[PDB]
Amino acid sequence: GVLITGCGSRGDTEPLVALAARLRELGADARMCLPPDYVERCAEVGVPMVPVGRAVRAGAREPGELPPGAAEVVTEVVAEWFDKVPAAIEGCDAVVTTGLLPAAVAVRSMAEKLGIPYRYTVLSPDHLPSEQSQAERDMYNQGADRLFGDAVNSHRASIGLPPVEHLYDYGYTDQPWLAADPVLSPLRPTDLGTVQTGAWILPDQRPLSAELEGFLRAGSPPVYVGFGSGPAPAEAARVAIEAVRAQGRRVVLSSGWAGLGRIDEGDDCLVVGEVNHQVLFGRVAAVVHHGGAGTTTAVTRAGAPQVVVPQKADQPYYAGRVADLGVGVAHDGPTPTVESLSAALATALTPGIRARAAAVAGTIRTDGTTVAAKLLLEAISRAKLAAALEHH
Protein backbone atom coordinates (compact mmCIF):
# COMPACT_ATOMS: atom_id res chain seq x y z
CA GLY A 1 0.00 0.00 0.00
CA VAL A 2 0.84 3.71 0.11
CA LEU A 3 0.16 5.96 3.09
CA ILE A 4 -0.71 9.61 2.50
CA THR A 5 -0.80 11.96 5.51
CA GLY A 6 -1.25 15.59 6.42
CA CYS A 7 -2.49 18.05 8.98
CA GLY A 8 -3.73 21.37 7.66
CA SER A 9 -6.56 23.26 6.03
CA ARG A 10 -8.48 22.25 2.91
CA GLY A 11 -5.66 23.46 0.66
CA ASP A 12 -3.13 21.20 2.39
CA THR A 13 -5.51 18.27 2.23
CA GLU A 14 -7.22 18.31 -1.16
CA PRO A 15 -3.99 17.60 -3.12
CA LEU A 16 -3.37 14.58 -0.88
CA VAL A 17 -6.89 13.25 -1.50
CA ALA A 18 -6.28 13.73 -5.25
CA LEU A 19 -3.09 11.68 -5.09
CA ALA A 20 -4.74 8.94 -2.99
CA ALA A 21 -7.67 8.66 -5.42
CA ARG A 22 -5.33 8.54 -8.43
CA LEU A 23 -3.21 5.82 -6.85
CA ARG A 24 -6.33 3.72 -6.18
CA GLU A 25 -7.38 4.17 -9.83
CA LEU A 26 -3.92 2.84 -10.77
CA GLY A 27 -4.40 -0.25 -8.57
CA ALA A 28 -2.49 0.77 -5.44
CA ASP A 29 -4.08 0.45 -1.98
CA ALA A 30 -3.60 4.09 -1.00
CA ARG A 31 -4.99 5.10 2.39
CA MET A 32 -4.80 8.29 4.45
CA CYS A 33 -4.32 9.83 7.87
CA LEU A 34 -5.94 13.29 8.07
CA PRO A 35 -7.71 15.56 10.56
CA PRO A 36 -11.37 14.66 11.26
CA ASP A 37 -12.59 17.57 9.09
CA TYR A 38 -12.01 15.43 6.01
CA VAL A 39 -14.00 12.28 6.76
CA GLU A 40 -16.82 13.16 4.35
CA ARG A 41 -14.47 14.31 1.57
CA CYS A 42 -12.47 11.08 1.60
CA ALA A 43 -15.54 8.87 1.72
CA GLU A 44 -17.25 10.54 -1.24
CA VAL A 45 -14.26 9.72 -3.50
CA GLY A 46 -13.79 6.18 -2.13
CA VAL A 47 -10.52 6.78 -0.30
CA PRO A 48 -9.98 5.07 3.07
CA MET A 49 -8.99 7.52 5.77
CA VAL A 50 -8.16 7.29 9.48
CA PRO A 51 -8.94 10.51 11.42
CA VAL A 52 -6.05 11.77 13.55
CA GLY A 53 -6.03 14.60 16.08
CA ARG A 54 -8.05 17.77 16.53
CA ALA A 55 -10.23 19.31 13.83
CA VAL A 56 -8.52 22.11 11.91
CA ARG A 57 -11.68 24.19 11.35
CA ALA A 58 -12.46 26.21 14.50
CA GLY A 59 -16.22 25.65 14.10
CA ALA A 60 -15.64 21.88 14.07
CA ARG A 61 -14.00 22.02 17.52
CA GLU A 62 -15.52 22.66 20.94
CA PRO A 63 -15.65 26.25 22.22
CA GLY A 64 -12.17 27.15 23.53
CA GLU A 65 -10.60 23.99 22.09
CA LEU A 66 -7.19 24.88 20.64
CA PRO A 67 -6.24 24.06 17.02
CA PRO A 68 -3.73 21.27 16.21
CA GLY A 69 -1.17 23.95 15.25
CA ALA A 70 -1.24 25.63 18.70
CA ALA A 71 2.14 25.51 20.47
CA GLU A 72 0.32 24.66 23.73
CA VAL A 73 -0.84 21.28 22.44
CA VAL A 74 2.20 20.19 20.41
CA THR A 75 3.19 17.38 22.83
CA GLU A 76 -0.34 15.94 22.54
CA VAL A 77 -0.23 16.24 18.73
CA VAL A 78 3.06 14.32 18.46
CA ALA A 79 1.68 11.61 20.78
CA GLU A 80 -1.56 11.29 18.80
CA TRP A 81 0.23 10.83 15.47
CA PHE A 82 2.58 8.22 16.99
CA ASP A 83 -0.53 6.49 18.41
CA LYS A 84 -2.76 6.37 15.30
CA VAL A 85 -0.34 6.07 12.37
CA PRO A 86 1.09 2.57 13.16
CA ALA A 87 -2.13 0.72 12.23
CA ALA A 88 -2.43 2.72 9.01
CA ILE A 89 1.21 2.49 7.91
CA GLU A 90 1.32 -1.31 8.32
CA GLY A 91 1.72 -2.96 4.92
CA CYS A 92 2.72 0.29 3.21
CA ASP A 93 5.65 0.60 0.82
CA ALA A 94 5.90 4.42 0.75
CA VAL A 95 4.56 7.52 2.50
CA VAL A 96 3.67 10.98 1.14
CA THR A 97 3.07 13.90 3.51
CA THR A 98 2.33 17.61 3.65
CA GLY A 99 1.37 20.17 6.28
CA LEU A 100 2.00 20.53 10.01
CA LEU A 101 5.64 19.86 10.86
CA PRO A 102 5.30 18.01 14.22
CA ALA A 103 2.85 15.56 12.59
CA ALA A 104 5.12 15.15 9.53
CA VAL A 105 8.16 14.34 11.69
CA ALA A 106 6.14 11.69 13.55
CA VAL A 107 5.12 10.14 10.23
CA ARG A 108 8.67 10.18 8.84
CA SER A 109 9.88 8.55 12.08
CA MET A 110 7.47 5.67 11.55
CA ALA A 111 8.54 5.41 7.89
CA GLU A 112 12.18 5.32 9.07
CA LYS A 113 11.39 2.46 11.48
CA LEU A 114 9.78 0.48 8.65
CA GLY A 115 12.55 1.37 6.19
CA ILE A 116 10.13 2.75 3.58
CA PRO A 117 10.53 5.90 1.46
CA TYR A 118 9.03 9.14 2.79
CA ARG A 119 8.30 12.16 0.61
CA TYR A 120 7.23 15.60 1.79
CA THR A 121 5.37 17.89 -0.56
CA VAL A 122 5.02 21.67 -0.65
CA LEU A 123 2.28 23.48 -2.54
CA SER A 124 3.82 26.91 -3.25
CA PRO A 125 7.41 27.59 -4.34
CA ASP A 126 8.10 30.24 -1.67
CA HIS A 127 7.77 27.44 0.92
CA LEU A 128 10.61 25.33 -0.51
CA PRO A 129 13.59 25.01 1.86
CA SER A 130 15.83 26.02 -1.09
CA GLU A 131 13.88 29.31 -1.36
CA GLN A 132 14.83 30.18 2.23
CA SER A 133 18.16 31.61 3.35
CA GLN A 134 20.58 29.44 5.34
CA ALA A 135 19.87 31.66 8.38
CA GLU A 136 16.13 31.05 7.95
CA ARG A 137 16.58 27.27 7.68
CA ASP A 138 18.80 27.37 10.81
CA MET A 139 16.08 29.30 12.62
CA TYR A 140 13.31 26.88 11.59
CA ASN A 141 15.37 23.89 12.69
CA GLN A 142 16.22 25.40 16.07
CA GLY A 143 12.61 26.40 16.70
CA ALA A 144 11.26 22.94 15.86
CA ASP A 145 13.89 21.14 17.93
CA ARG A 146 13.22 23.41 20.91
CA LEU A 147 9.43 23.31 20.66
CA PHE A 148 8.82 19.61 20.09
CA GLY A 149 12.17 17.83 19.71
CA ASP A 150 12.01 16.21 23.15
CA ALA A 151 8.49 14.89 22.53
CA VAL A 152 9.49 13.51 19.12
CA ASN A 153 12.59 11.87 20.59
CA SER A 154 10.62 10.28 23.44
CA HIS A 155 8.28 8.63 20.94
CA ARG A 156 11.17 7.63 18.67
CA ALA A 157 12.79 5.87 21.63
CA SER A 158 9.47 4.10 22.34
CA ILE A 159 9.83 2.35 18.96
CA GLY A 160 13.60 1.76 19.20
CA LEU A 161 14.83 4.58 16.99
CA PRO A 162 17.79 6.84 17.77
CA PRO A 163 17.18 10.52 18.58
CA VAL A 164 17.00 12.97 15.69
CA GLU A 165 17.62 16.72 15.44
CA HIS A 166 17.14 19.44 12.80
CA LEU A 167 13.45 18.65 12.58
CA TYR A 168 12.70 21.14 9.79
CA ASP A 169 15.30 19.38 7.59
CA TYR A 170 13.91 16.04 8.77
CA GLY A 171 10.20 16.73 8.18
CA TYR A 172 10.60 18.61 4.88
CA THR A 173 13.47 16.39 3.65
CA ASP A 174 16.45 17.80 1.76
CA GLN A 175 14.39 17.98 -1.43
CA PRO A 176 10.62 18.06 -1.03
CA TRP A 177 8.35 17.73 -4.05
CA LEU A 178 6.57 20.79 -5.42
CA ALA A 179 2.97 19.84 -6.22
CA ALA A 180 2.26 23.10 -8.02
CA ASP A 181 1.49 24.00 -11.61
CA PRO A 182 4.55 25.31 -13.50
CA VAL A 183 2.63 27.99 -15.47
CA LEU A 184 1.02 29.40 -12.34
CA SER A 185 4.12 28.81 -10.19
CA PRO A 186 7.35 28.75 -12.22
CA LEU A 187 10.51 27.43 -10.56
CA ARG A 188 13.82 29.30 -10.96
CA PRO A 189 15.97 27.79 -13.75
CA THR A 190 18.93 27.07 -11.42
CA ASP A 191 16.90 24.70 -9.22
CA LEU A 192 17.75 21.22 -10.51
CA GLY A 193 16.87 19.48 -7.24
CA THR A 194 13.16 20.23 -6.81
CA VAL A 195 10.82 17.80 -8.54
CA GLN A 196 7.82 19.86 -9.69
CA THR A 197 5.04 17.40 -10.45
CA GLY A 198 2.30 19.83 -11.34
CA ALA A 199 -0.73 20.41 -9.14
CA TRP A 200 -2.52 17.39 -7.65
CA ILE A 201 -6.08 17.73 -8.91
CA LEU A 202 -8.92 15.24 -8.39
CA PRO A 203 -11.23 15.14 -11.45
CA ASP A 204 -14.44 16.18 -9.75
CA GLN A 205 -17.45 14.01 -10.61
CA ARG A 206 -19.78 15.41 -7.93
CA PRO A 207 -23.01 16.90 -9.27
CA LEU A 208 -24.00 20.46 -8.46
CA SER A 209 -26.90 20.74 -6.04
CA ALA A 210 -30.41 21.16 -7.47
CA GLU A 211 -30.41 24.65 -5.94
CA LEU A 212 -27.16 25.68 -7.65
CA GLU A 213 -28.20 24.10 -10.95
CA GLY A 214 -31.52 25.96 -10.75
CA PHE A 215 -29.75 29.25 -9.94
CA LEU A 216 -27.38 28.89 -12.91
CA ARG A 217 -30.23 28.07 -15.30
CA ALA A 218 -32.41 30.97 -14.09
CA GLY A 219 -30.30 33.92 -15.21
CA SER A 220 -27.04 35.34 -16.51
CA PRO A 221 -23.71 33.78 -15.40
CA PRO A 222 -23.04 34.87 -11.80
CA VAL A 223 -19.85 35.95 -10.05
CA TYR A 224 -18.52 33.55 -7.40
CA VAL A 225 -17.16 35.00 -4.15
CA GLY A 226 -15.32 32.89 -1.56
CA PHE A 227 -12.47 33.00 0.95
CA GLY A 228 -11.81 29.27 1.36
CA SER A 229 -10.55 27.97 4.71
CA GLY A 230 -9.34 31.36 5.87
CA PRO A 231 -10.78 34.52 7.40
CA ALA A 232 -12.74 36.90 5.23
CA PRO A 233 -12.32 40.70 5.29
CA ALA A 234 -14.57 42.94 7.39
CA GLU A 235 -18.06 43.14 5.90
CA ALA A 236 -16.94 40.70 3.16
CA ALA A 237 -20.43 39.52 2.21
CA ARG A 238 -21.95 43.00 2.10
CA VAL A 239 -19.07 44.50 0.12
CA ALA A 240 -18.94 41.58 -2.32
CA ILE A 241 -22.69 41.34 -2.89
CA GLU A 242 -23.00 45.10 -3.39
CA ALA A 243 -19.96 45.26 -5.73
CA VAL A 244 -21.14 42.31 -7.85
CA ARG A 245 -24.63 43.88 -8.03
CA ALA A 246 -23.00 47.16 -9.12
CA GLN A 247 -21.63 45.31 -12.16
CA GLY A 248 -25.12 44.02 -13.03
CA ARG A 249 -24.28 40.46 -12.02
CA ARG A 250 -25.82 37.81 -9.79
CA VAL A 251 -23.77 36.33 -6.92
CA VAL A 252 -22.81 32.84 -5.76
CA LEU A 253 -21.47 33.39 -2.25
CA SER A 254 -19.42 30.57 -0.76
CA SER A 255 -19.90 30.55 3.02
CA GLY A 256 -16.47 28.94 3.52
CA TRP A 257 -14.91 28.39 6.91
CA ALA A 258 -15.58 32.09 7.61
CA GLY A 259 -19.32 31.32 7.55
CA LEU A 260 -20.34 34.13 5.20
CA GLY A 261 -24.04 34.65 4.57
CA ARG A 262 -26.60 36.68 2.67
CA ILE A 263 -27.26 40.33 3.57
CA ASP A 264 -30.91 40.37 2.47
CA GLU A 265 -33.51 38.11 0.83
CA GLY A 266 -32.48 39.08 -2.71
CA ASP A 267 -33.05 36.25 -5.19
CA ASP A 268 -30.01 37.39 -7.19
CA CYS A 269 -27.80 35.72 -4.55
CA LEU A 270 -27.25 32.08 -3.71
CA VAL A 271 -25.23 31.07 -0.66
CA VAL A 272 -23.42 27.75 -1.08
CA GLY A 273 -21.47 25.29 1.01
CA GLU A 274 -19.07 22.79 -0.56
CA VAL A 275 -19.40 22.70 -4.38
CA ASN A 276 -17.77 21.21 -7.46
CA HIS A 277 -15.47 24.09 -8.38
CA GLN A 278 -14.23 22.49 -11.58
CA VAL A 279 -17.77 22.47 -12.96
CA LEU A 280 -19.06 25.67 -11.34
CA PHE A 281 -16.11 27.81 -12.39
CA GLY A 282 -16.82 26.94 -16.04
CA ARG A 283 -20.29 28.48 -15.60
CA VAL A 284 -19.50 31.78 -13.83
CA ALA A 285 -18.54 35.18 -15.26
CA ALA A 286 -15.69 35.70 -12.76
CA VAL A 287 -14.34 34.43 -9.44
CA VAL A 288 -13.46 36.69 -6.49
CA HIS A 289 -11.28 34.70 -4.10
CA HIS A 290 -8.47 34.80 -1.50
CA GLY A 291 -5.65 33.48 -3.71
CA GLY A 292 -5.10 30.10 -2.05
CA ALA A 293 -2.83 27.85 -4.13
CA GLY A 294 -5.53 25.28 -4.88
CA THR A 295 -8.33 27.77 -5.50
CA THR A 296 -6.14 29.84 -7.83
CA THR A 297 -5.20 26.63 -9.68
CA ALA A 298 -8.84 25.59 -10.07
CA VAL A 299 -9.99 29.04 -11.24
CA THR A 300 -7.12 29.29 -13.73
CA ARG A 301 -7.75 25.77 -15.10
CA ALA A 302 -11.48 26.57 -15.48
CA GLY A 303 -10.67 29.70 -17.49
CA ALA A 304 -12.71 32.11 -15.35
CA PRO A 305 -11.48 35.71 -15.02
CA GLN A 306 -10.36 36.49 -11.48
CA VAL A 307 -10.23 39.08 -8.76
CA VAL A 308 -7.75 38.00 -6.10
CA VAL A 309 -8.21 39.59 -2.68
CA PRO A 310 -5.21 38.18 -0.79
CA GLN A 311 -5.41 37.91 3.01
CA LYS A 312 -2.09 36.43 4.14
CA ALA A 313 0.86 34.08 3.58
CA ASP A 314 1.30 32.93 -0.06
CA GLN A 315 -1.85 34.72 -1.26
CA PRO A 316 -0.17 37.97 -2.41
CA TYR A 317 2.13 35.73 -4.51
CA TYR A 318 -0.90 34.23 -6.28
CA ALA A 319 -2.53 37.62 -6.74
CA GLY A 320 0.68 38.76 -8.44
CA ARG A 321 0.82 35.67 -10.65
CA VAL A 322 -2.79 36.14 -11.77
CA ALA A 323 -2.10 39.80 -12.63
CA ASP A 324 1.13 38.86 -14.48
CA LEU A 325 -0.67 36.15 -16.47
CA GLY A 326 -3.29 38.75 -17.44
CA VAL A 327 -6.19 36.53 -16.38
CA GLY A 328 -7.42 38.64 -13.48
CA VAL A 329 -6.94 41.58 -11.17
CA ALA A 330 -4.80 41.71 -8.05
CA HIS A 331 -6.99 43.74 -5.71
CA ASP A 332 -4.90 46.35 -3.91
CA GLY A 333 -5.09 45.12 -0.33
CA PRO A 334 -6.92 42.52 1.81
CA THR A 335 -10.08 44.56 2.53
CA PRO A 336 -12.11 45.76 -0.44
CA THR A 337 -14.62 48.57 -0.41
CA VAL A 338 -17.66 48.41 -2.70
CA GLU A 339 -15.88 50.93 -4.94
CA SER A 340 -12.53 49.09 -5.11
CA LEU A 341 -14.08 45.65 -5.67
CA SER A 342 -16.54 47.05 -8.24
CA ALA A 343 -13.62 48.60 -10.15
CA ALA A 344 -11.63 45.34 -10.02
CA LEU A 345 -14.67 43.39 -11.22
CA ALA A 346 -15.29 45.80 -14.10
CA THR A 347 -11.73 45.11 -15.25
CA ALA A 348 -12.18 41.33 -14.81
CA LEU A 349 -15.45 41.35 -16.79
CA THR A 350 -14.08 42.60 -20.14
CA PRO A 351 -14.16 40.43 -23.29
CA GLY A 352 -10.34 40.72 -23.46
CA ILE A 353 -9.67 39.24 -20.02
CA ARG A 354 -12.27 36.52 -20.72
CA ALA A 355 -10.28 35.49 -23.80
CA ARG A 356 -6.95 35.64 -21.95
CA ALA A 357 -8.33 33.50 -19.11
CA ALA A 358 -9.71 30.99 -21.64
CA ALA A 359 -6.28 30.71 -23.28
CA VAL A 360 -4.27 30.28 -20.07
CA ALA A 361 -6.72 27.57 -18.90
CA GLY A 362 -5.49 25.20 -21.62
CA THR A 363 -1.88 25.48 -20.39
CA ILE A 364 -2.65 24.22 -16.85
CA ARG A 365 -1.92 20.49 -16.61
CA THR A 366 -4.11 18.15 -14.60
CA ASP A 367 -1.89 15.03 -14.67
CA GLY A 368 0.46 15.89 -11.78
CA THR A 369 -0.83 12.94 -9.75
CA THR A 370 0.34 10.60 -12.53
CA VAL A 371 3.84 12.13 -12.32
CA ALA A 372 3.76 11.56 -8.55
CA ALA A 373 2.51 7.97 -9.00
CA LYS A 374 5.43 7.21 -11.34
CA LEU A 375 7.89 8.78 -8.87
CA LEU A 376 6.43 6.54 -6.16
CA LEU A 377 6.71 3.47 -8.41
CA GLU A 378 10.42 4.21 -8.91
CA ALA A 379 11.08 4.84 -5.18
CA ILE A 380 9.37 1.56 -4.16
CA SER A 381 11.04 -0.47 -6.94
CA ARG A 382 14.51 0.57 -5.71
CA ALA A 383 2.91 -5.21 -10.39
CA LYS A 384 -0.48 -3.49 -10.80
CA LEU A 385 1.05 0.00 -10.49
CA ALA A 386 3.80 -0.53 -13.10
CA ALA A 387 1.22 -2.16 -15.40
CA ALA A 388 -1.26 0.71 -14.96
CA LEU A 389 1.37 3.36 -15.68
CA GLU A 390 2.63 1.47 -18.76
CA HIS A 391 -0.99 1.52 -19.98
CA HIS A 392 -1.40 5.30 -19.43
Ligand SMILES: O=c1ccn([C@@H]2O[C@H](COP(=O)(O)OP(=O)(O)O[C@H]3O[C@H](CO)[C@@H](O)[C@H](O)[C@H]3F)[C@@H](O)[C@H]2O)c(=O)[nH]1
Ligand atom coordinates in the same frame (compact mmCIF):
# COMPACT_ATOMS: atom_id res chain seq x y z
O1 LIG B 1 -16.47 24.48 -2.21
C1 LIG B 1 -15.29 24.13 -2.45
C2 LIG B 1 -14.22 24.71 -1.76
C3 LIG B 1 -12.92 24.29 -2.07
N1 LIG B 1 -12.72 23.34 -3.00
C4 LIG B 1 -11.38 22.92 -3.38
O2 LIG B 1 -10.53 22.90 -2.24
C5 LIG B 1 -9.21 23.36 -2.61
C6 LIG B 1 -8.85 24.59 -1.79
O3 LIG B 1 -7.48 24.87 -2.03
P1 LIG B 1 -6.73 26.13 -1.39
O4 LIG B 1 -5.27 25.81 -1.59
O5 LIG B 1 -7.26 27.41 -1.95
O6 LIG B 1 -7.13 25.91 0.15
P2 LIG B 1 -7.43 26.88 1.39
O7 LIG B 1 -7.48 25.98 2.59
O8 LIG B 1 -8.60 27.77 1.11
O9 LIG B 1 -6.19 27.85 1.44
C7 LIG B 1 -4.98 27.76 2.13
O10 LIG B 1 -4.17 26.58 2.14
C8 LIG B 1 -3.41 26.77 0.94
C9 LIG B 1 -2.45 25.61 0.71
O11 LIG B 1 -1.49 25.57 1.77
C10 LIG B 1 -2.67 28.13 0.93
O12 LIG B 1 -2.20 28.39 -0.40
C11 LIG B 1 -3.54 29.33 1.31
O13 LIG B 1 -2.82 30.48 1.70
C12 LIG B 1 -4.56 28.97 2.33
F1 LIG B 1 -5.19 29.84 3.06
C13 LIG B 1 -9.25 23.69 -4.09
O14 LIG B 1 -8.85 22.53 -4.83
C14 LIG B 1 -10.72 23.96 -4.29
O15 LIG B 1 -11.10 23.90 -5.67
C15 LIG B 1 -13.82 22.77 -3.67
O16 LIG B 1 -13.64 21.88 -4.54
N2 LIG B 1 -15.05 23.19 -3.36
